[PDB]
Design an enzyme around this catalytic site. Structure first.
Site, PDB file in Angstrom:
ATOM      1  N   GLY A  27       0.799  -1.223   0.000  1.00  0.00           N
ATOM      2  CA  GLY A  27       0.000   0.000   0.000  1.00  0.00           C
ATOM      3  C   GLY A  27       0.831   1.272   0.000  1.00  0.00           C
ATOM      4  O   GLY A  27       2.067   1.227  -0.027  1.00  0.00           O
ATOM      5  N   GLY A  29       0.650   5.136   2.122  1.00  0.00           N
ATOM      6  CA  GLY A  29       0.040   6.055   3.078  1.00  0.00           C
ATOM      7  C   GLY A  29       0.654   7.440   2.977  1.00  0.00           C
ATOM      8  O   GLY A  29       1.456   7.711   2.074  1.00  0.00           O
ATOM      9  N   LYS A  49       9.634  -0.391   3.564  1.00  0.00           N
ATOM     10  CA  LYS A  49       8.967   0.911   3.569  1.00  0.00           C
ATOM     11  C   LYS A  49       9.899   2.013   3.063  1.00  0.00           C
ATOM     12  O   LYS A  49      11.012   2.195   3.574  1.00  0.00           O
ATOM     13  CB  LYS A  49       8.412   1.252   4.959  1.00  0.00           C
ATOM     14  N   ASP A 145      -0.996   6.197  20.639  1.00  0.00           N
ATOM     15  CA  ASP A 145      -1.731   6.154  19.371  1.00  0.00           C
ATOM     16  C   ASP A 145      -1.763   4.760  18.759  1.00  0.00           C
ATOM     17  O   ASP A 145      -1.625   4.588  17.555  1.00  0.00           O
ATOM     18  CB  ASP A 145      -1.197   7.196  18.388  1.00  0.00           C
TER      19      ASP A 145
END
Ligand SMILES: O=C(C1CC1)N1CCC[C@@H](Nc2nccc(-n3c(-c4ccc5ccccc5c4)nc4ccc(O)cc43)n2)C1
Length: 351
Positions: A27, A29, A49, A145
């Site tokens: 994906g 982001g 990444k 978070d």
């Protein structure tokens, strides 16, 4: 001679070491683009990444830098461990992108949440999240978070937390993509000050979602989110109010009031596997844990250590996993220009 090669994976160009082969998109982001690859040197599958110009603004840079430092410090099976970090660029002046490499996992926790899960699997995922969180807390890292989109799992039900949460002191980005805030504690929603068990709230939101198969506290913004919290759990006690800033206190002390539902109502039996005495018992223990994690007031919410002791969880307890040695800089939270961040990140990449 070139140690690198380039391929287009989706919209993005990946320039990676030649060891990394057959790149497939996972994906993209706001802060990273991710792909699967075969690592011909390790002879195993990896995830990579790409951080594009992470120094481009204070928000990107502070996160990228802090996460790079922390990744090199932590050492725990339930927390991301870096296999490799590299830049294809040859000097600080030319420096553009950072590539991070870790073990290839099988699924995102969001996907796992949508599955009907037995109690063995649920309790084991939760146990691992608690171990990961314990490990962070033991290094003075409080996440604040935690959310299922940043947690990954393998087919054998092993789990890893991928990020390190909010900046301890902590702005803005011209992002197309919004931040997921649904798993954040009341003390984060209300800017309250917090301790270790801020992270228990998020674990509770995940657990409840595993049961309910719906996000417990959705909302366009914090206002909407807080409304969803109070109607289900009710207005907090006076003692909770006292610890609110006068401005937030006025707002909270003034919302449409709510008694809140009991946990049997919040999570009915129909939601739980209850086809055997074993499962009926586990349903009861799961709801008890939930009732202790989804507590608005942090003073009354269970700690990480007590959650690990809860009968729903403690069947997995292992001293080697729960009591691992803490991670090993002390100035992490700072403010810098683009150019300063660029060099800070560059020196960390280069070691
Ligand atoms: O469809 C696929 C692959 C077959 C195309 N999947 C399903 C989802 C899990 C994928 N494996 C995987 N493993 C590790 C991290 C990761 N990962 C990473 C990721 C990936 C590499 C990282 C390297 C260093 C530091 C952090 C890293 C984080 N970010 C993700 C964001 C969303 C997400 O669903 C996964 C993310 N994703 C493999």
């Amino acid at each position: 001679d070139n140690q690198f090669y380039s391929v287009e994976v989706g919209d993005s160009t990946f320039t990676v070491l030649k060891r990394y082969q057959n790149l497939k998109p996972i994906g993209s982001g706001a802060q990273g683009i991710v792909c699967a690859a075969y690592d011909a040197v390790l002879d195993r599958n990896v995830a990579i990444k790409k951080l594009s110009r992470p120094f481009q603004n204070q928000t990107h840079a502070k996160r990228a830098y802090r996460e790079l430092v922390l990744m090199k410090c932590v050492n725990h099976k339930n927390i991301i461990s870096l296999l490799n970090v590299f830049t294809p660029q040859k000097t600080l002046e030319e420096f553009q992108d950072v590539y991070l490499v870790m073990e290839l996992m099988d699924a995102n926790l969001c996907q796992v949440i949508q599955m009907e899960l037995d109690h063995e699997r649920m309790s084991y995922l939760l146990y691992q999240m608690l171990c990961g969180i314990k490990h962070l807390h033991s290094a003075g890292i409080i996440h604040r978070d935690l959310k299922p989109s940043n947690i990954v799992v393998k087919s054998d039900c092993t789990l890893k937390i991928l990020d390190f949460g909010l900046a301890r002191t902590a702005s803005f980005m011209m992002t197309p993509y919004v931040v997921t805030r649904y798993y954040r504690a009341p003390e984060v929603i209300l800017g309250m000050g917090y301790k270790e068990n801020v992270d228990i709230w998020s674990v509770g939101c995940i657990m409840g979602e595993m049961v309910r198969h719906k996000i417990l506290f959705p909302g366009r913004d914090y206002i909407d989110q807080w409304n969803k919290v109070i109607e289900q759990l009710g207005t907090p006690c006076p003692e909770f109010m006292k610890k609110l800033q006068p401005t937030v206190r006025n707002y909270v002390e003034n919302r449409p009031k709510y008694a809140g539902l009991t946990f049997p109502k919040l999570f009915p039996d129909s939601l739980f596997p209850a086809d055997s005495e074993h499962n009926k018992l586990k349903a009861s223990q799961a709801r008890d844990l939930l009732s202790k994690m989804l507590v608005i007031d942090p003073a009354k919410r269970i700690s990480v250590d007590d959650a690990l002791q809860h009968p729903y969880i403690n069947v997995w307890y292992d001293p080697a996993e729960v009591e691992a040695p803490p991670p090993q800089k002390q100035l992490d939270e700072r403010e810098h220009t683009i150019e300063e961040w660029k060099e800070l990140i560059y020196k960390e990449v280069m070691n």
